[PDB]
Each structure stands twice: as structure tokens, then as C-alpha cells.
């Protein structure tokens, strides 16, 4: 024999250390956000809406295919990301109609909450539940396994156009710099998150013994008067299901601060269970004056002492305390390069090969392998790390035999593995939502 590489090593300790928890959940309720992603390039698209090529422009909102295509053009020259609503209800149905019907368009199940059904319906001897906007060609979609009541059906989907260019890509006189893509939609349900109500109601008949929400951060953009309606609307229903039942609340994509300290106040406080990435950490530290709130932007990788901190003081400001009736004792925390999964003591089990779970599925569901294809991943985590940048903490390096390390800081355990990040992956939208949904799997509730 030869040397195995460090990530051979770290996949066979995995395979090793994880195993489902001793007590396993039967039935798991999934809301409320969900659409279907439609990618394409989007210059074929263009083309195939019979359009010749006009002159880049920007527009704020698109009304029409004018609109789109100059905005389209703009971002194309560019080689620049950028997302846009369009307005015109009919004409985005024929578009849209038009980008699935295309020959080659790929077509994905999208959506915080629909993505964590998906994964956890991989199981079948789990029970899912999912509510949200699913019309025909979501539904089609989605795993057989995943109940969706019949009140939660609807005649159209959302769909989420998701217009491609490749570097160096022409089109008469346009050229790209640099591969991006240019989003559009006309997403009014998961907007308004206009499911809830349905949602809320299938629960008493379910009984669930999980629950798991999402698409709060959509309302981003919405009455602030709507968005307290809404959060009012989840913490009652929360208060209505029987307790000792776990609710993990998926937090992504939030740029404002007034909903995000709404979400803080209100929704933490009624949920077991958190589950975020880098971004929106650093943002909630930022709003209240966390650790590393100095901090403007991550350079590079997230310094793990500087995240433990924010997770640390997240859990003693806002988790589970003798006086403060808050049930937040989980926050399962997901970067590119390492996961770590913090827990208040005492309230759950399985934490090591949870983390190591979440972790293994960024590989496998990046790659598209059922294992991991030890040839494909790469082991880019920190060798070695403090563990609290602030307090004084435990100098750690990193071992490719015993990944998952385990520290322990007033009442808090943290549990921190490297990922095995695939090195040429097909598509990695919605990773964060296959790592929570496995992380809650292979968690137990004490």
C-alpha cells in the first residue's frame, strides 16, 4: 500500500462515526417556501423568444421583454450577477413557458423549505410533510414520498428563470467577461409568504415531530406591516403545537436590519433549533453588537473562534436560560470549507456524526455521487484554529483520522468538522438546506 490522501482518510473516519440516532423521528413538517428553478442559457433564450440583439440598459424593474433583454445584456457585459422582478404577470407565464419548454433547460425543485423536504424525503422510513407554492410541474418534481396537503396545490408554479452566460460568450456585439447568470421572477407567494396559513393548519393532523420553517428572509422588500402579521402568525402557531416538539428555523439571504432584529426578538425565542451560514452570521453580530459586529466582511475563510464567539453569544443572549423563556438550544452553523453544530447542554443527542452528516452531504449532493468520490473533494478548512478569537481558547490542528473535535465553553458544546468540498461540482444552490436537513436527521431531542 501507498499513502491514502487526507481526504480518503477523513471519509473513512465519517463512514465510521456516523450512525442515525437511537431514537429516530417518524414525520417531519417542511414550510413554506418553494418554486422551480428553470436554468438556461440566456442568451438561447433571448434568441428563442425571437429577439435580436438591442443595446445593454439597465432597468429596476422589468415590465416587459424589452426590458429584459437590455437589462439581460447589461449584466451579460458586465459578467455580473443580478436578480430583477417582472411585472407583467401573463407575459412572464408565455417566458417562462417559453425558458421550460426549452430543449436542454435543466428544471430544479427551489426553495429553502421544499429543499429540506426534498432531502429529508430521501429516507423512507421518514414522513414528510411540505406546504408551500407547488403547482403541477413542482409537484412532478418533487420526491413521491413528500406529502403535499391538497389545500397547498396550486394550477401554476413559480418559476425562477435563472439566465446563464459562459466566459467569453457572443452574441453579436456583446461579449462576456466573465460566466454569471441573470435571475428573474414574478413571485408574489413566497414573497408574501402566502402558505403559511395552510401550513399552520395541516400541522394538528400531522403531528409532526418535527417541524422545520423557512422563507422568512423573502419578505425582504414587503410592508413592514405585512411582515409583522406574518411573524405574529408563526409565533402563535408555534405556541399552538404540543410542547417538546423541536422547531428549526433556516435563516438565509437577509440584507435588512429591522426584520432581521424583528426575527431576533420574536421567532429565536420559539424555536428549538437555528441554521445559518457565514453571512447571515457576521449579519446578525452587526445589527446587535455582537463579537465581531467591527467586523465589515469576512476575509476569506471565517476565522472559527470569531464565528464560536457570535454562536456562543447568540445562545447566552437569546437561547435557553433559567429566566428568559427562550427555547433556541441548536444553532447548526454551515460555511463552505467547515460546519460547526452548537449546543446548549443537556437538550440533544448525536451532535458528533450530526455535524459529520451535514458535512459529508455538502461533498456527495455537490459532486452528484451517492458517496463521496474521494478524487473530486478537497480538504481547504484551517489546520489549525483558536477556538474563540475574544475569550482565550484551545489551540486545535486538524486531524484527517479523528475530524469531528469537540470543546466545551460555560454550558455550550461545540462541534466543529471540516467539509470535503467538491472540487468540480455540478450545481451547489440550496447546499445549506440538504446540510441542515441532514443535521436534524441525524439529531435526536432529548
Known sequence: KLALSPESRLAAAWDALIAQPARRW???????????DVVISGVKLLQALGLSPGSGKDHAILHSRSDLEEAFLYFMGKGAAAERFFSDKETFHDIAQAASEFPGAQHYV?????????????????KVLLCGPIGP?????????????PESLQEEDEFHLILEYLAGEEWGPFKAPHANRFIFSHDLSNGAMNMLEVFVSS???FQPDLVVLSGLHMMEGQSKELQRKRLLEVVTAISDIPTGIPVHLELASMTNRELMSSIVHQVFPAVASLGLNEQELLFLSQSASGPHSSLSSWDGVPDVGMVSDILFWILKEHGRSENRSSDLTRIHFHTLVYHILATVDGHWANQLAAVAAGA???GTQACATETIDTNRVSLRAPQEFTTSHLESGSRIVLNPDKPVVEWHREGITFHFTPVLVCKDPVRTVGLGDAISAEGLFYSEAR
Open 203 to 205: 400541522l394538528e393532523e
Open 26 to 36: 417518524r414525520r417531519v413538517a417542511v414550510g413554506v417556501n418553494a418554486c422551480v
Open 137 to 149: 410541474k413542482l409537484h412532478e418534481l418533487l420526491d413521491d414520498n413528500v406529502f403535499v396537503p
Open 110 to 126: 427551489g426553495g429553502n423549505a421544499a429543499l429540506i423536504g426534498q432531502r429529508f424525503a430521501a429516507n423512507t422510513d421518514l
Open 360 to 362: 459529508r452531504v455538502a
